[PDB]
Each structure stands twice: as structure tokens, then as C-alpha cells.
Amino acid sequence: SMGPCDIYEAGDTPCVAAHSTTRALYSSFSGALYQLQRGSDDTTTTISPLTAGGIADASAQDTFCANTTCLITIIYDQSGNGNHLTQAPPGGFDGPDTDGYDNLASAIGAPVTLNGQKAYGVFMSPGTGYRNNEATGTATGDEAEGMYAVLDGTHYNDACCFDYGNAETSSTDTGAGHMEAIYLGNSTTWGYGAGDGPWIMVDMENNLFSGADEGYNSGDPSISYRFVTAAVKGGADKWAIRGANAASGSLSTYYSGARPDYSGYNPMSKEGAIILGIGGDNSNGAQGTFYEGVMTSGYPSDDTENSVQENIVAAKYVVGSLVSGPSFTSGEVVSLRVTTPGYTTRYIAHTDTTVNTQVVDDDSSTTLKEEASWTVVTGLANSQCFSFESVDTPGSYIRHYNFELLLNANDGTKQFHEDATFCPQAALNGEGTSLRSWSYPTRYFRHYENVLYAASNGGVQTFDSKTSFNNDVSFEIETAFA
Numbered sequence: 493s494m495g496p497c498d499i500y501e502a503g504d505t506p507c508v509a510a511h512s513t514t515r516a517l518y519s520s521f522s523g524a525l526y527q528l529q530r531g532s533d534d535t536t537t538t539i540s541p542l543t544a545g546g547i548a549d550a551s552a553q554d555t556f557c558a559n560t561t562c563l564i565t566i567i568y569d570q571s572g573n574g575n576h577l578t579q580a581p582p583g584g585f586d587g588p589d590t591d592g593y594d595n596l597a598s599a600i601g602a603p604v605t606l607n608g609q610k611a612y613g614v615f616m617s618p619g620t621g622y623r624n625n626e627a628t629g630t631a632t633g634d635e636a637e638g639m640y641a642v643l644d645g646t647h648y649n650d651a652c653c654f655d656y657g658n659a660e661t662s663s664t665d666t667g668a669g670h671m672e673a674i675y676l677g678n679s680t681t682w683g684y685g686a687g688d689g690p691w692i693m694v695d696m697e698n699n700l701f702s703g704a705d706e707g708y709n710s711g712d713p714s715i716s717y718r719f720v721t722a723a724v725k726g727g728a729d730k731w732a733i734r735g736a737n738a739a740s741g742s743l744s745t746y747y748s749g750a751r752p753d754y755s756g757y758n759p760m761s762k763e764g765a766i767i768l769g770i771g772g773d774n775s776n777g778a779q780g781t782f783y784e785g786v787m788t789s790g791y792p793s794d795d796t797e798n799s800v801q802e803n804i805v806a807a808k809y810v811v812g813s814l815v816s817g818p819s820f821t822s823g824e825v826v827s828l829r830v831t832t833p834g835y836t837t838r839y840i841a842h843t844d845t846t847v848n849t850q851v852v853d854d855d856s857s858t859t860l861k862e863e864a865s866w867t868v869v870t871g872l873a874n875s876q877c878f879s880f881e882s883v884d885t886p887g888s889y890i891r892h893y894n895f896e897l898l899l900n901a902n903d904g905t906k907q908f909h910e911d912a913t914f915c916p917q918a919a920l921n922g923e924g925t926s927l928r929s930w931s932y933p934t935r936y937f938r939h940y941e942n943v944l945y946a947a948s949n950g951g952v953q954t955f956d957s958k959t960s961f962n963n964d965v966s967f968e969i970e971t972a973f974a
């Protein structure tokens with residue numbers, strides 16, 4: 493058979509970078525797709541397809557990552573050009589990680605199946621980013637290229653910038669025309685399309701374009717696919733945006749034609765670096781999910797892209813399970829007991845907005861019993877996951893904010909919903925559940941000095957301590973006190 497990069501090669505516009513955590517993009521590719529790093533010992537392993545041209549060995553990831561946390565350290569370039577994506581460095585903007593690097597992604601925030609076989613995408617929270625500033629074979633200057641990505645059309649924000657494609661080698665803004673990358677989100681700072689978003693646009697630096705005009709272009713529709721194929725291409729005073737449901741049907745063209753008639757976009761000044769999840773100046777406020785994508789040399793024909801889209805549809809992307817372990821039912825009322833030795837009589841409770849742990853038993857005040865009792869409801873931002881509503885304060889839910897867990901009233905916003913959704917995971921220490929943040933899947937409910945945080949297994953916050961991490965994120969599900 494033929495994978496996407498075999499199709500691009502047959503069209504004489506071959507891949508020069510080919511990135512996926514889900515599958516091989518060449519029929520003969522059997523090498524490593526990505527690298528994992530686990531928090532227990534900070535060692536790494538690689539994940540390859542199970543067959544040549546096949547699907548990632550998700551079972552090998554699950555084995556490596558058992559009873560710990562995993563990060564995706566490298567997304568390998570399958571093309572042989574060496575264009576592997578690694579932790580993005582500081583640039584015009586600092587990231588939030590060590591020395592202003594951007595965060596690595598969780599390995600488990602984007603479970604899918606491909607024709608019924610589990611695999612994992614790259615779920616990127618704000619501050620997450622990958623890059624290769626030493627890329628070879630990528631288009632530079634006004635040279636032609638194409639690219640595509642398969643993304644989560646429901647995972648996005650309006651912050652700059654969830655990009656995949658060609659960028660600056662310095663990680664700084666070197667001007668109009670020094671980028672050409674896919675963007676997905678509902679930014680309206682520069683361009684935007686019809687409806688409420690999100691939109692596929694093209695980041696050409698100091699502009700996200702939804703078509704020929706700065707700002708609004710009517711022909712760029714809002715994306716309402718869970719899996720979106722975004723296909724972008726650029727050449728000498730020509731470029732295009734095409735989009736599809738990656739699960740069904742064909743690409744439609746939402747822009748095709750001349751460069752925007754504004755200073756600095758023709759000819760282009762591409763530099764050949766590759767970015768994922770961030771802007772070319774390291775703008776790192778965006779979120780999104782990446783499953784697969786490529787960059788090519790040459791300007792692909794519509795026919796070549798249509799063949800690629802037929803291949804994507806035949807890969808049969810379906811949403812995977814985000815939940816493991818004992819889990820919950822909507823309307824259940826629970827208490828959550830600390831399992832860390834020395835703290836095992838404590839329960840997750842709250843004192844006004846502060847979520848904390850306290851000793852709770854049958855002699856406790858009814859006030860504290862209610863503060864240690866939680867109504868489990870369907871996840872506000874994801875219906876597979878859950879949200880935890882206060883018994884004493886109905887309408888208020890556990891949410892993260894500056895990575896501390898707070899009890900705040902639901903204000904009906906997308907942001908609150910996302911900050912208040914948690915995905916049960918079989919407990920890292922085998923005692924009950926661990927509650928993983930849906931929006932920041934590197935982070936978990938974690939008690940630290942008897943206060944609740946959304947903590948990572950190591951990190952820049954004091955409450956990201958690796959000491960006692962597995963125990964401090966494991967809670968037993970008990971009958972509610974009230």
C-alpha cells in the first residue's frame with residue numbers, strides 16, 4: 493500500500509519532514525515514531541510501529557509508563573532528513589519550563605484508535621512546544637512547499653499560536669514572510685473566518701491569514717470536526733488552505749490564489765525551521781492536539797492531497813478512552829481519601845475557595861463532612877471525564893488556577909469548563925484513582941503540605957516535587973460523609 497509520504501513522493505513533491513505519534517507515514521517505515529521519558533527514573537524509550545507502515549505500539553507505551561507519568565521528548569522525522577522535533581527553546585517569548593524552554597507534552601492526553609487499535613496523539617496545553625531550528629531539506633525563501641496536519645478540531649484557544657510548519661531559525665520575529673505554518677484556533681487578533689471558530693489559517697508572521705485579505709475572509713469556515721485534516725501549500729505568489737473531516741470525505745478549498753497584497757508577503761522569506769504548538773517567536777499561549785503531519789518540497793497538486801486525505805480517512809481515527817481505574821457515575825457523591833503514608837486519615841476537603849486535606853471522621857462537624865463530600869458530574873469540557881461539585885456549595889466545582897485547586901462557581905465559560913474537568917486514571921500507587929487534568933494532562937490532583945494542586949511529576953513549581961508524587965496523586969473513593 494502507500495502512506496501519505498509515498499503519495500507525496502509519487503506526486504514529485506516529496507516529504508522532507510514527517511511527524512506522527514500514531515502511525516508510520518511511509519509504507520516501509522519501521523523505525524522509531526517518538527521517544528518517551530518517564531518520571532519514575534527519568535529514563536527514555538522509543539515507540540515504533542507494530543508492523544512496517546503500521547500503527548504505533550501503544551501497548552509498549554502503556555508498559556513503559558505504568559505506575560508513573562510520561563512525556564513525549566521527541567517526535568522523530570520519518571523522512572530520513574533528521575528533522576526531529578524536540579523541546580522548544582526560548583525565543584522572543586520565554587516558555588514556562590527550565591531556562592525558558594517550553595513544556596513537553598504528556599504521552600496520554602490524546603488517546604485515539606486507528607481502525608480499532610489504540611494510539612496516542614500529542615495533547616499540547618498552553619506553554620507546550622516542539623521545534624527544530626537545524627532542519628534540512630525544508631523550503632526557504634520563496635521556494636514551494638506543502639504541509640498537512642491531522643488535529644483535534646475541538647481542542648484550541650484564541651492565544652498565539654497553535655502552529656505546525658515553517659518558521660524562523662532564531663525563535664524570534666524576523667518579519668512578515670518569515671513563516672508559513674498551519675494555524676488552528678479562534679484567534680481574531682489578525683485573521684478570522686465565518687462563524688465562531690475555530691479556523692484553519694496560515695501564519696505568515698505578523699498575520700494569521702484566513703485568505704487574501706487581512707482580517708475577515710468569508711470563505712474560511714468554522715471547523716466542526718473532531719478530527720480535522722488541515723492542508724496548506726505555498727509557492728511563488730500562490731498559497732492555499734484546504735480542510736476536511738479526517739474521519740470522512742474529501743478536502744474542500746477555502747483559499748487558493750495570490751499572496752495577501754500587504755508589504756512583506758511576496759516574495760516570502762522562509763527560514764526552514766519547524767515548529768509545533770507555538771508561534772515562530774515562541775508565542776506559547778495556544779493549545780491543540782497533533783496526531784500526524786508532514787512538510788514537503790514542492791507545491792503539491794490538489795490530486796496528491798486528495799489521495800493523502802483518502803489515506804487519512806482509511807486510517808479510521810476515532811476518539812479513544814481517556815479514563816481508567818475505578819472511575820465514577822454522574823450524580824454519585826463521594827469522599828476522596830489520602831493514601832500517602834502518614835496522611836491516610838485525611839480527605840480532600842475545602843475551606844472556602846482553598847481545596848485542602850483534613851482529617852475527617854464520624855465525629856467531625858457536619859460542616860466539614862459536607863466540605864469533604866463531592867457530587868461527581870459529567871465533565872464540563874469532556875463528557876468521558878468528570879467534574880467535582882461541592883456538596884455544601886452547589887454550583888461550585890474543583891478547578892485549577894495557577895495550578896492550585898480552588899473551589900469556584902461555574903461561570904459557564906469554556907475556560908472554567910476546561911479548568912474543572914478531570915479524567916480518572918487507575919491510581920499510580922494502586923490505591924483507588926488518580927485524577928488527571930483534562931486541559932493539562934501532565935498534571936494531577938496532588939496534595940502538598942495538605943493543600944491541593946494540579947501538580948506534575950517534577951516541574952518548576954514547589955508542589956511538582958517528585959518526592960512522594962505517586963502516593964500524593966492517589967486517592968481512595970469512599971462513601972460521602974454527607
Ligand SMILES: *[C@@H]1O[C@H](CO)[C@@H](O[C@@H]2O[C@H](CO)[C@@H](O)[C@H](O)[C@H]2NC(C)=O)[C@H](O)[C@H]1NC(C)=O
Nearest residue numbers: 649650678679680681688689903904905906907
Ligand atoms: C474564542 O472562543 C471562546 C469560546 O467560545 C470565546 O470565549 C468567550 O470569551 C469571553 C472573554 O474573552 C467570555 O466573556 C465569554 O464568556 C467566553 N465564552 C465562552 C463560551 O467561553 C472567546 O471570546 C473567543 N475568542 C475570540 C478572540 O473571539
Ligand SMILES: *[C@@H]1O[C@H](CO)[C@@H](O)[C@H](O)[C@H]1NC(C)=O
Nearest residue numbers: 558559918919920921922923
Ligand atoms: C500500578 O498501578 C496499577 C493500577 O492502579 C495497580 O494495579 C498496581 O498495584 C500499581 N503498582 C504499584 C507498584 O504501585
Ligand SMILES: *[C@H]1[C@H]([NH3+])[C@@H](CO)[C@H](O)[C@H]1O
Nearest residue numbers: 653697698699771772773
Ligand atoms: C510572529 C507573530 N507574533 C505571530 C503571528 O503571526 C507569529 O506566530 C510569530 O512568530
